């Protein structure tokens, strides 16, 4: 096992298409993107629950408010 690890590192050094890291196939960038977008949206729509209390409004209307 030790010899094979040495040989793998050596042949990776000798080859040009060698991986820039020994951290095999990464497949957890999608989940990161999804949770990032999810937290962003959840904040964006936990804002406008607070920023739209909207007690009442005052619209100027011809004939009545003027």
């Amino acid at each position: 096992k030790l010899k094979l690890d040495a040989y793998h590192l050596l042949e990776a050094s000798q080859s040009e298409t060698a991986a820039k890291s020994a951290l095999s196939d990464l497949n957890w960038f999608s989940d990161l993107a999804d949770i990032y977008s999810g937290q962003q949206t959840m904040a964006e729509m936990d804002v406008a629950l607070k920023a739209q209390g909207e007690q009442k409004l005052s619209y100027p209307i011809q004939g009545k408010n003027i």
């Binding site: 010899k3 094979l4 040495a6 040989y7 793998h8 590192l9 050596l10 042949e11 990776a12 080859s15 298409t17 060698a18 991986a19 020994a22 095999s24």
Partner: protein, 37 residues
């Protein structure tokens, strides 16, 4: 004596290579490198 000479050369030419974990004719049976892609 022939066998002695053969092993005496095998030592010097195989034991410090880092490239010969076994014989090259049987490298198909080895596991695959995770770093190559």
């Amino acid at each position: 004596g022939k066998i002695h000479g053969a092993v005496w050369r095998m030592k010097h030419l195989f034991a410090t290579n880092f490239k010969m974990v076994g014989h090259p004719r049987y490298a198909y049976a080895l596991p695959k490198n995770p770093l190559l892609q």
